[PDB]
Write an enzyme that holds these catalytic residues in place. Sequence first.
Site, PDB file in Angstrom:
ATOM      1  N   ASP A   7      -2.149  11.197  -1.952  1.00  0.00           N
ATOM      2  CA  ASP A   7      -1.315  10.814  -0.822  1.00  0.00           C
ATOM      3  C   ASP A   7       0.110  11.084  -1.278  1.00  0.00           C
ATOM      4  O   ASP A   7       0.504  10.660  -2.365  1.00  0.00           O
ATOM      5  CB  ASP A   7      -1.500   9.334  -0.487  1.00  0.00           C
ATOM      6  CG  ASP A   7      -2.671   9.089   0.443  1.00  0.00           C
ATOM      7  OD1 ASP A   7      -3.593   9.931   0.475  1.00  0.00           O
ATOM      8  OD2 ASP A   7      -2.669   8.055   1.143  1.00  0.00           O
ATOM      9  N   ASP A 126     -11.613   7.106  11.410  1.00  0.00           N
ATOM     10  CA  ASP A 126     -11.769   5.802  10.811  1.00  0.00           C
ATOM     11  C   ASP A 126     -12.772   5.035  11.634  1.00  0.00           C
ATOM     12  O   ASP A 126     -12.707   5.021  12.857  1.00  0.00           O
ATOM     13  CB  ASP A 126     -10.452   5.048  10.760  1.00  0.00           C
ATOM     14  CG  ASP A 126      -9.423   5.723   9.883  1.00  0.00           C
ATOM     15  OD1 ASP A 126      -9.776   6.654   9.136  1.00  0.00           O
ATOM     16  OD2 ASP A 126      -8.256   5.311   9.946  1.00  0.00           O
TER      17      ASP A 126
END
EC number: 5.3.1.16
Length: 241
Positions: A7, A126
């Site tokens: 990330d 998600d």
Amino acid sequence: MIIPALDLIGGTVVRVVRARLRDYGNDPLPRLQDYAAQGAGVLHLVDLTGAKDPAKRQIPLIKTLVAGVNVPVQVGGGVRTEEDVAALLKAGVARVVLASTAVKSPDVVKGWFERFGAQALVLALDVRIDEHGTKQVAVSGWQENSGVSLEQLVETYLPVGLKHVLCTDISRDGTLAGSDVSLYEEVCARYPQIAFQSSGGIGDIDDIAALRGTGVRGVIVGRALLEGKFTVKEAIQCWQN
């Protein structure tokens, strides 16, 4: 395969922990390069700077990173428009990771499949398992469910050749808690023409072992690698055995 993940925020390596962020330094390229050196065939990057401000998409850094390894990198973060997609591909990314926009504007995204091809796109969904046991899609861990199940959304995109789905179990995201095996076993069996990637919950090599017989094609590993729980080499050895 194993899919090592990083990330990035302003060039800083980070990952969501559980939801906070921790700093693993500012040399993403040697990291990725070592991942590739150990046999990774795919890498995953989330541009958290780009996610917050599309105009601040870390395109120059992304260019560097992609150029600096010999493997396809899938890149996500603030992919809101057709122009975002094209920009990332032009920068050399192998696949663009489409998250909230895949839920938000499916018709628009289906057009992206038509333009860019299904090999250029990964749908990142998600998933929350609700009270009934339905795999509910949510656009993030901090927002409510969006009113569509994983299956319904996958089915939406099958007509335009959907091939890659990254599925994060929201409860396990960045928790080291062990991934949810049953979730992946069911979806993978239902859509064998799709390559599912699992994400979240990988804390040790046993978590990777747990995913082996499930049909899951790729296993995103972020945190565990950064924290020295195991190496990419060990992850691959386990995944392949």
